[PDB]
Amino acid sequence: EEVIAEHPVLLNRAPTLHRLGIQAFEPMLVEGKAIQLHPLVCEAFNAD
Amino acid sequence: GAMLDVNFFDELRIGLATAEDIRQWSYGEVKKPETINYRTLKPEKDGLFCEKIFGPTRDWECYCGKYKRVRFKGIICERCGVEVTRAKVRRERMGHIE
Amino acid sequence: ALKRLKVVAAFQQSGNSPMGMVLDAVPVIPPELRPMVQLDGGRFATSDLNDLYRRVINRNNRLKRLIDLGAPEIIVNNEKRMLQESVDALFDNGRRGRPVTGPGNRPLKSLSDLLKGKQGRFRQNLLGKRVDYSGRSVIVVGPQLKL
Amino acid sequence: GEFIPRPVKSSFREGLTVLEYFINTHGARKGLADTALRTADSGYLTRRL
Amino acid sequence: NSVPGAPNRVSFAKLREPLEVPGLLDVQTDSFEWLIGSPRWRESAAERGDVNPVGGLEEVLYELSPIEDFSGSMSLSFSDPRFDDVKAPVDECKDKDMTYAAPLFVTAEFINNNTGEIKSQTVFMGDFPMMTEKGTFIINGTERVVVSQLVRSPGVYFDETIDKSTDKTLHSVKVIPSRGAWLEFDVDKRDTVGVRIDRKRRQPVTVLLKALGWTSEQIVERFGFSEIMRSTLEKDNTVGTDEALLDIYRKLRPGEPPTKESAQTLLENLFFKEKRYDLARVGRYKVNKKLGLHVGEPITSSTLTEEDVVATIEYLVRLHEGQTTMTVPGGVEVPVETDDIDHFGNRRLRTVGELIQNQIRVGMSRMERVVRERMTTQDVEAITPQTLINIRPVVAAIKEFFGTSQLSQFMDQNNPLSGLTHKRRLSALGPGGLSRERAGLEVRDVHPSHYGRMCPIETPEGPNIGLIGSLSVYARVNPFGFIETPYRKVVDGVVSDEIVYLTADEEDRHVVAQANSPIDADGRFVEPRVLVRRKAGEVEYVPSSEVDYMDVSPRQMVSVATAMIPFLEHDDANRALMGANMQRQAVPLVRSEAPLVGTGMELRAAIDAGDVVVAEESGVIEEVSADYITVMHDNGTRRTYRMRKFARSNHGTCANQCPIVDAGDRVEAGQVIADGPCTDDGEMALGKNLLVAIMPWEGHNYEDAIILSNRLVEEDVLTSIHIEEHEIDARDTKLGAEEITRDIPNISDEVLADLDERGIVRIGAEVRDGDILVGKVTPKGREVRDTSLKVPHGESGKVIGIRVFSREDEDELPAGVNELVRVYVAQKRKISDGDKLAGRHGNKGVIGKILPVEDMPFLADGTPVDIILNTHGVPRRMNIGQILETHLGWCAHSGWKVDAAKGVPDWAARLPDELLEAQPNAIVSTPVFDGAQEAELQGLLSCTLPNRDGDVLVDADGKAMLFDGRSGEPFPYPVTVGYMYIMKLHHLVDDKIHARSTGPYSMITQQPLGGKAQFGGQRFGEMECWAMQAYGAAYTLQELLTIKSDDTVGRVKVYEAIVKGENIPEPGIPESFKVLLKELQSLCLNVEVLS
Amino acid sequence: WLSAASFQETTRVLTDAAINCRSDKLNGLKENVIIGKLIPAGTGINRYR
DNA sequence: AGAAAACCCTTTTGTTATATAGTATTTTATCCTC
DNA sequence: GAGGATAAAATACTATATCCTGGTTAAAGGGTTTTCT
RNA sequence: CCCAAAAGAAGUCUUUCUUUUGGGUUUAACCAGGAU
Ligand SMILES: [Zn+2]
């Protein structure tokens, strides 16, 4: 947890149609096996 | 220019190649359609994998076996004719068919 | 005349000579770029380039023998035709006539197929590459993270 | 592409009959087909641009 | 229903179906036993096609024999194919990797045409794979299925096209044979009726006609009624007949010395010989129908004839003339019209029998060439039939087909429904059919002739949409291969029960009514006007006096998978499709449960799919146990049924079977006696009934996500079992001495603890990633390499079964091995984030957050809801069906009682008897297209029993009042609650997650490999380097393409800098660039890097 | 010729470039991606580099 | 001494292609001119 | 009547998103050699 | 660059240093089936 602090990570989805398909977030640990995504960017990625 | 490589790139220049250049690139002549001998599982001689043309298959190890130590470097084998060097040279040397 | 002038001017301006069109020697790609894979059980799968080079070498040896041993012009001419076809298949398989097929009636990947389409070393191994420090997963929604 | 002059007369709450459902699938499928082919085509135009 | 021991599942159906659903696997089983000629098929063809019963092998042999030399001095013939008993039973063949087959023998007779010496022998023709009784072949231990193919039927096809330059209609005809050479007669601008013999250049038909022996007088005598024919006659430039043949030779076969004899021979051999032009039997029937030549004579002969060619030319010219009907001398008149190539009267179905017959045909052709050649290089009076037959090509062809093809596919065994739907599949792509990348939008549509022959809903969603479909419930394949459907015939407005099977053409000719029409209980329509289907698929109102046929019942258009969706007629086709493609991807759960609201089709699908055990004969149960069941038949005999316990399926799901009978019960023939993977008492059970609310909740179920309660984890309500298989073979090798030994060279004592004396993990030890399963050492060529098979990356779970095959035990091992130890590892996966639950109607989602059981919206009495769905997804996608289901689900759970105190209420007048009242947890069924109306649902919801105390939790609208468990206050407005049947799809997260820091690299180019297996690294594709360029970030792109992928020194230097805290070094150049330079130089291009 | 060769008609572009003996000055964004050097745009330009 | 099973080499009728859309270059066919 | 010039047709080449997993990877014939009877 | 084994030295009751040998591509191409 002390290593990843303030260490950006790139998230991408395919197809990457337009410029906003690749975005850099800050990672935080969660429980399980699924990447958690912010709901306000689903339109940019076009991800359901 | 720049021979092998490393960042002095300033221009790529393509062009037709003549027979003389083709015979310049090659380190030997392939004249036998044998890939590898099954029993020895080692390259044939004068074939499509000959070590004398394209280089040794193992790091600092000649085909005959007269040399297997690093200190021996650059000595063209006096018996088998394979140059003692690193195996990566098999990714660079080219042959030519006459 | 205008459509022709392009190539004549191109060969006129530069010091290069047209004799490069007709080959006298055929280069051979380094082995590591056409490796054979010895899958378990002696299943040595060979890259198509190996088979095409094998054909060319066989025909060249046969023609050399026939010339040295002495033969009528007709047989030598036919052997030269076969050599010409073998080289044509080596450089661009399927451009003229029936493709040289191998196991199970399939075409063989000559050299020119390594630099073409979405399988060549121009748009599948130079513009986009697999990378380290990476992963993938299924995404879910969390209305607790900030933006 | 021409309209069927029947036409459908029932709402999905009341439930369609058999024939009406058939003539509905008629036009329903081409939507998916065109979706696939157009999403295939768009990439070529983006690449050339 | 009619199954002796089926559960009592009450139905809302109003209509009655005269015809029971046929055997759902009958297509395959009855299309194969035709091939071998079993007595059952002989009996079936006796009551139908008794004129000429012949099996596929018999037909091939008769067409082949006799084989004669050019001189005709000797001949070889075959006859009477015969089959022996199978070598081993099904279970043993599956376990020991032995193909399921039987010997084949044939009687070969050799006759010398100058001595009269006849020599007969029985020659062995190889091992012929047979078919298990449930429709599947077994090959090399795996189970395979052969899919039927849709192809364009052979015959004559006419079509007209508009001309751009001149705006004239141009008609064209194609005579497409089976294994022949085409010939097209087409008209064009500058009207000129030409030919295209084979696929060569054009030429006037008059050339062909004269070549056939027609004088310039005869043609104008008969073809004297059109200007085009006379114009072509005027401009022919062909003299006599010989010049015609020579000209034909100059085009058919260029660059040859033309001569009359050879030209005539070649022309005759192309078409008029039963050697290179076979219209089969279907083709000849179709041609005779289209031109009406021989209506009476039986179809015996499959080559063209001059009369057919002249008839087709006349037909084409008349069609261009605009005629309406034509009369051919010696034949009845027919209509002249263009043809369509999607009408299911023109697309035929090559089933499993036909494909194997074709493969045997080509194998025998090769064997025939061999025998003909050998017939002239061996001295007479030493030749015996066994010394001329070479069997290898036939077995080679059969094996090639069954191992390598686009129609012999691995069975999909996610669950029984997947198999049942895979056997009844029709694929239009394969050898001899269109291709996935070369199909237009005119073949993927749904032609109006599909009604009742191919389901319009069930179809893949990807790029295959339209090329693959499923055979409907009632359809059958007639002898020629055209698909037929039943219709109940009406005589004088009286609906009889005479069922007649019709193909596409006959259905086109007549007028057909609808199944769910107002019958007045005496076979008479209530009102004169009723929807019908006319010739071209038009829907219109015709009075109830012209109707000629009616559908046997509704549902006739929906395949097996789509017939199991309740309230199908309320859902849009687009979502019913995703509902019918998401029942073939369930996963057999640890404990199964039958759905509360089904569609009456579960029982038949379960019993036919073959995954349940069915008592073969009536009797009384003697002893029952988890392993086997003993049935004591009525007359002495006794039978023992063995059960498959924890057997791996082709896609990694368990295949349990447990009995449902006790030691004293009596069973009846056809009764279900043991459940299967996804069955519950004989009914399909793909999922679970969960309590569901339809409110949006805190955004966790945002954009199709789902929320589960924790009760679905504690109590294993959704808990699957998966099984993985690991193999390793100790190859003999040229060096030899490979052995599966325990002692692992250069190994620790702890890591070797589990291994048994032989060197195989003890059954019952948890082999987590990084353990040993087998100890294998092979010579180095000690001089050995320890290829000790280890648990690959990401697996775990106990070891439930080992199987070791030994050469010393004289097993059938692969050539050049001694042992083939194989291990199984099994694991129980619970539900968790990332899974892909989905209902039936197409409401797919991925579990978003498994909340603890305390903070869930709970009803007034304390019951917590077990799932939450969004409201914003229902109305927009038009799958309202689910909401209706939800309501009905609740009515099924709570149990209702319509109060018939003073007359039945009007809304329940037509409700069937013994449905006015139901006990709690009562199962009901609503057939697909005749189900529970809205008024009936309102009535049921209006009256429902209290739960325990005198409280009703769901009011009339169907919405209850929920307490918010997280905060405490009640939600201001009522919410919908009910019971919905949801499944667990096979897209679990644990098979998807993957990461890589540093791992294996490729060999030709130094980039990392791809895929979760090896170690794999994600691909930074082409259009993910445009986004980086667009942002303006350059350093990140440079490092993503140089020091992370293929810069040989960059990788090690960055690793060292990172571990030692230094600043990352600079990049070099990529290896793939040098590979490109070498590839260019190999082409004689002098590429040089100037400076 | 590198960019054009990587775009379309690889054979024709390569052959005509070989005939004309064209020398490709390295400027653009596709060739600098190919040879693993900083793109001459964004952060890579001289003013900010 | 003859027969049967095991090496070493070679090499793979016209099939079946249900294609469109666009452009670019070679025939060839016919029309116009001298 | 013969030759040249222009439409026509006739062929030749080029292109038609992203990602993931599972099964196979040669046979067949001719010529030659060794062991068993 | 990395790992494995053998021997010697120091301390801890198990880590570091030195020497010898061995080593690293589960690669690859096809067909098929899926996902968004
Ligand atoms: Zn040496």
Short mmCIF file of N, CA, C and O in Angstrom, two decimals, chain E residues 52-104:
data_model
loop_
_atom_site.label_atom_id
_atom_site.label_comp_id
_atom_site.label_asym_id
_atom_site.label_seq_id
_atom_site.Cartn_x
_atom_site.Cartn_y
_atom_site.Cartn_z
N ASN E 52 -38.33 -48.54 -53.70
CA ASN E 52 -36.89 -48.74 -53.84
C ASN E 52 -36.19 -48.46 -52.52
O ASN E 52 -35.65 -47.37 -52.29
N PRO E 53 -36.18 -49.44 -51.61
CA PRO E 53 -35.39 -49.31 -50.38
C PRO E 53 -33.95 -49.75 -50.62
O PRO E 53 -33.70 -50.90 -50.95
N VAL E 54 -33.02 -48.82 -50.45
CA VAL E 54 -31.59 -49.12 -50.56
C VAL E 54 -30.82 -48.20 -49.63
O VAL E 54 -31.10 -47.00 -49.56
N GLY E 55 -29.85 -48.77 -48.92
CA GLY E 55 -29.04 -48.00 -48.00
C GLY E 55 -27.90 -47.29 -48.70
O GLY E 55 -27.60 -47.51 -49.88
N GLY E 56 -27.24 -46.40 -47.95
CA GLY E 56 -26.18 -45.61 -48.53
C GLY E 56 -25.02 -46.45 -49.03
O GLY E 56 -24.56 -46.28 -50.16
N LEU E 57 -24.53 -47.37 -48.19
CA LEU E 57 -23.44 -48.23 -48.62
C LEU E 57 -23.85 -49.08 -49.82
O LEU E 57 -23.08 -49.26 -50.77
N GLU E 58 -25.06 -49.63 -49.78
CA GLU E 58 -25.55 -50.41 -50.91
C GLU E 58 -25.57 -49.56 -52.17
O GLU E 58 -25.16 -50.01 -53.24
N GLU E 59 -26.04 -48.32 -52.06
CA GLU E 59 -26.11 -47.45 -53.23
C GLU E 59 -24.72 -47.17 -53.79
O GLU E 59 -24.51 -47.22 -55.01
N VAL E 60 -23.76 -46.89 -52.91
CA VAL E 60 -22.41 -46.60 -53.37
C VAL E 60 -21.82 -47.82 -54.07
O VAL E 60 -21.23 -47.71 -55.15
N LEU E 61 -21.97 -48.99 -53.46
CA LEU E 61 -21.43 -50.20 -54.08
C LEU E 61 -22.08 -50.48 -55.43
O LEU E 61 -21.38 -50.81 -56.39
N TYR E 62 -23.41 -50.35 -55.53
CA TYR E 62 -24.07 -50.61 -56.80
C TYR E 62 -23.62 -49.62 -57.87
O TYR E 62 -23.40 -50.00 -59.02
N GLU E 63 -23.48 -48.34 -57.51
CA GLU E 63 -23.00 -47.37 -58.48
C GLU E 63 -21.58 -47.68 -58.91
O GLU E 63 -21.23 -47.49 -60.08
N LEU E 64 -20.75 -48.16 -57.99
CA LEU E 64 -19.36 -48.44 -58.30
C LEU E 64 -19.22 -49.67 -59.19
O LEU E 64 -18.71 -49.58 -60.31
N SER E 65 -19.69 -50.82 -58.72
CA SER E 65 -19.52 -52.06 -59.46
C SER E 65 -20.39 -52.05 -60.72
O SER E 65 -21.43 -51.38 -60.76
N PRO E 66 -20.00 -52.80 -61.75
CA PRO E 66 -18.77 -53.59 -61.87
C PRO E 66 -17.58 -52.73 -62.30
O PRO E 66 -17.74 -51.70 -62.94
N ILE E 67 -16.36 -53.15 -61.95
CA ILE E 67 -15.14 -52.51 -62.42
C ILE E 67 -14.58 -53.40 -63.52
O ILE E 67 -14.32 -54.59 -63.29
N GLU E 68 -14.40 -52.84 -64.71
CA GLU E 68 -13.95 -53.59 -65.87
C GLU E 68 -12.79 -52.88 -66.55
O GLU E 68 -12.71 -51.65 -66.56
N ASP E 69 -11.89 -53.68 -67.12
CA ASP E 69 -10.78 -53.18 -67.90
C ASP E 69 -11.28 -52.72 -69.27
O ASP E 69 -12.43 -52.93 -69.65
N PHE E 70 -10.39 -52.07 -70.02
CA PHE E 70 -10.76 -51.58 -71.34
C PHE E 70 -11.19 -52.72 -72.25
O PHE E 70 -12.19 -52.62 -72.96
N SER E 71 -10.43 -53.83 -72.24
CA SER E 71 -10.78 -54.96 -73.08
C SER E 71 -12.08 -55.62 -72.64
O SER E 71 -12.75 -56.27 -73.45
N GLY E 72 -12.45 -55.47 -71.37
CA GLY E 72 -13.65 -56.12 -70.87
C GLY E 72 -13.50 -57.61 -70.65
O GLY E 72 -14.51 -58.33 -70.65
N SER E 73 -12.28 -58.09 -70.46
CA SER E 73 -12.02 -59.51 -70.27
C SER E 73 -12.13 -59.95 -68.82
O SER E 73 -12.04 -61.15 -68.54
N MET E 74 -12.34 -59.02 -67.89
CA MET E 74 -12.44 -59.37 -66.48
C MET E 74 -13.20 -58.26 -65.76
O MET E 74 -13.22 -57.12 -66.21
N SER E 75 -13.81 -58.63 -64.63
CA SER E 75 -14.63 -57.69 -63.88
C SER E 75 -14.56 -58.01 -62.39
O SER E 75 -14.32 -59.15 -61.99
N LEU E 76 -14.78 -56.97 -61.58
CA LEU E 76 -14.82 -57.08 -60.13
C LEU E 76 -16.07 -56.37 -59.64
O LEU E 76 -16.39 -55.27 -60.10
N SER E 77 -16.79 -57.00 -58.70
CA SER E 77 -18.06 -56.47 -58.22
C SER E 77 -18.17 -56.65 -56.71
O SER E 77 -17.55 -57.55 -56.13
N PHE E 78 -18.99 -55.80 -56.09
CA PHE E 78 -19.25 -55.82 -54.66
C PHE E 78 -20.75 -55.96 -54.41
O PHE E 78 -21.56 -55.76 -55.31
N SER E 79 -21.10 -56.31 -53.17
CA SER E 79 -22.51 -56.40 -52.79
C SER E 79 -22.61 -56.73 -51.31
O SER E 79 -21.62 -57.05 -50.65
N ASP E 80 -23.85 -56.65 -50.80
CA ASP E 80 -24.25 -57.06 -49.45
C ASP E 80 -23.28 -56.58 -48.37
O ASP E 80 -22.55 -57.40 -47.79
N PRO E 81 -23.25 -55.29 -48.06
CA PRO E 81 -22.50 -54.84 -46.88
C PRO E 81 -23.05 -55.46 -45.61
O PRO E 81 -24.26 -55.62 -45.45
N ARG E 82 -22.14 -55.81 -44.70
CA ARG E 82 -22.51 -56.53 -43.49
C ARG E 82 -21.69 -55.99 -42.32
O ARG E 82 -20.51 -55.68 -42.47
N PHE E 83 -22.33 -55.90 -41.16
CA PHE E 83 -21.72 -55.34 -39.96
C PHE E 83 -21.70 -56.37 -38.84
O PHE E 83 -22.69 -57.07 -38.62
N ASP E 84 -20.58 -56.44 -38.13
CA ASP E 84 -20.44 -57.32 -36.98
C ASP E 84 -20.71 -56.53 -35.70
O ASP E 84 -21.02 -55.34 -35.72
N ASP E 85 -20.58 -57.22 -34.56
CA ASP E 85 -20.78 -56.56 -33.27
C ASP E 85 -19.65 -55.58 -32.98
O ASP E 85 -18.52 -55.75 -33.43
N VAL E 86 -19.98 -54.54 -32.21
CA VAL E 86 -18.99 -53.55 -31.85
C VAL E 86 -17.87 -54.21 -31.04
O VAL E 86 -18.10 -55.17 -30.29
N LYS E 87 -16.65 -53.70 -31.21
CA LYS E 87 -15.51 -54.30 -30.52
C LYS E 87 -15.62 -54.16 -29.01
O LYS E 87 -15.36 -55.12 -28.28
N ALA E 88 -16.01 -52.98 -28.52
CA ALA E 88 -16.09 -52.73 -27.09
C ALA E 88 -17.29 -51.84 -26.82
O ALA E 88 -17.73 -51.11 -27.71
N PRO E 89 -17.84 -51.88 -25.61
CA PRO E 89 -19.01 -51.04 -25.30
C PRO E 89 -18.64 -49.57 -25.18
O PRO E 89 -17.47 -49.19 -25.20
N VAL E 90 -19.67 -48.74 -25.05
CA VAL E 90 -19.48 -47.29 -25.10
C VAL E 90 -18.59 -46.82 -23.96
O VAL E 90 -17.64 -46.07 -24.17
N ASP E 91 -18.89 -47.25 -22.73
CA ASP E 91 -18.14 -46.76 -21.58
C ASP E 91 -16.66 -47.13 -21.69
O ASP E 91 -15.79 -46.28 -21.47
N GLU E 92 -16.36 -48.38 -22.04
CA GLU E 92 -14.97 -48.80 -22.15
C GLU E 92 -14.25 -48.01 -23.24
O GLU E 92 -13.11 -47.59 -23.05
N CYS E 93 -14.91 -47.80 -24.38
CA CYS E 93 -14.29 -47.05 -25.46
C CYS E 93 -14.00 -45.62 -25.02
O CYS E 93 -12.94 -45.07 -25.35
N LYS E 94 -14.92 -45.00 -24.28
CA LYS E 94 -14.69 -43.64 -23.82
C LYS E 94 -13.56 -43.59 -22.80
O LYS E 94 -12.77 -42.64 -22.78
N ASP E 95 -13.46 -44.61 -21.94
CA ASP E 95 -12.47 -44.58 -20.87
C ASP E 95 -11.07 -44.87 -21.39
O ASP E 95 -10.10 -44.21 -20.98
N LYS E 96 -10.93 -45.83 -22.30
CA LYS E 96 -9.63 -46.32 -22.74
C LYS E 96 -9.16 -45.66 -24.03
O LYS E 96 -8.18 -46.13 -24.63
N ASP E 97 -9.83 -44.60 -24.48
CA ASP E 97 -9.43 -43.88 -25.68
C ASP E 97 -9.47 -44.77 -26.92
O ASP E 97 -8.60 -44.72 -27.78
N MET E 98 -10.51 -45.61 -27.00
CA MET E 98 -10.74 -46.46 -28.16
C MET E 98 -11.95 -45.97 -28.93
O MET E 98 -13.02 -45.76 -28.36
N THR E 99 -11.77 -45.78 -30.24
CA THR E 99 -12.85 -45.30 -31.09
C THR E 99 -13.96 -46.34 -31.17
O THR E 99 -13.70 -47.54 -31.26
N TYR E 100 -15.20 -45.87 -31.12
CA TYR E 100 -16.37 -46.74 -31.14
C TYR E 100 -16.70 -47.09 -32.58
O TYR E 100 -17.11 -46.22 -33.36
N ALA E 101 -16.51 -48.36 -32.96
CA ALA E 101 -16.69 -48.76 -34.34
C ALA E 101 -17.04 -50.24 -34.40
O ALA E 101 -17.07 -50.94 -33.39
N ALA E 102 -17.32 -50.70 -35.61
CA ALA E 102 -17.61 -52.10 -35.88
C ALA E 102 -16.92 -52.55 -37.16
O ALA E 102 -16.67 -51.73 -38.05
N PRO E 103 -16.61 -53.83 -37.29
CA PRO E 103 -16.03 -54.32 -38.55
C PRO E 103 -17.02 -54.22 -39.70
O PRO E 103 -18.24 -54.28 -39.51
N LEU E 104 -16.48 -54.05 -40.90
CA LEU E 104 -17.28 -54.02 -42.12
C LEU E 104 -16.72 -55.03 -43.11
O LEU E 104 -15.51 -55.05 -43.36
#
